Amino acid sequence: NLWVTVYYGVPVWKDAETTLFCASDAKAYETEKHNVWATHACVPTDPNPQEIHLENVTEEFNMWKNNMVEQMHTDIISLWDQSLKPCVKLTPLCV
């Protein structure tokens, strides 16, 4: 027969969904709207980003089912909603 044992300290990752904070090296001296959104909503950039490469690894990538881009799409929608306002805007609202 077989019995269940538990193991800790095991290097296992799982894919998931979380909110990702934006990073942008913006100085905000200019009155540009894209610059001031980057100052107001994002942090400055990494000086020394830590790059760790693995020798043996197996990974199935599916970028068409990638979630990461779905949040960034709404981020750019918010970016140009706060950055640019048209003279006249129209949207259909149907009951």
Partner: protein
């Protein structure tokens, strides 16, 4: 703790025992490093509190008397220890993870009795 994942199952089982041993800019990056370290410690204590139910608290390698269905592993299990890694094995039993945790907790419940 995610490093050295290229080794197989039987090698990771040994190496886990080896594992057992400009001011606003700097503040806003150091605060995120502090979030990483504090949530790492909080996740470690939360996982130890979870493991305290199963009776294996503080122990990296443990053994229980919980019965294992042959349908979950659906494999002879002799060759999963030498040539198959942890990452594939976790995806083999991803659908059947909650029910065996529920099996452990009630098994420890009659272990109390």
């Amino acid at each position: 703790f995610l490093g050295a994942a290229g080794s197989t199952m039987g090698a990771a089982s040994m190496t886990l025992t080896v594992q057992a041993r400009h001011l606003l800019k700097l503040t806003v990056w150091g605060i995120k490093q502090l979030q990483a370290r504090v949530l790492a410690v909080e996740r470690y204590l939360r996982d130890q509190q979870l493991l305290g139910i199963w009776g294996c608290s503080g122990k990296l390698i443990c053994c229980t008397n919980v019965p294992w269905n042959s349908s979950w592993s659906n494999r002879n299990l002799s060759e999963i220890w030498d040539n198959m890694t942890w990452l594939q094995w976790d995806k083999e039993i991803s659908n059947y993870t909650q029910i065996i945790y529920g099996l452990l907790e009630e098994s420890q419940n009659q272990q109390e009795k």
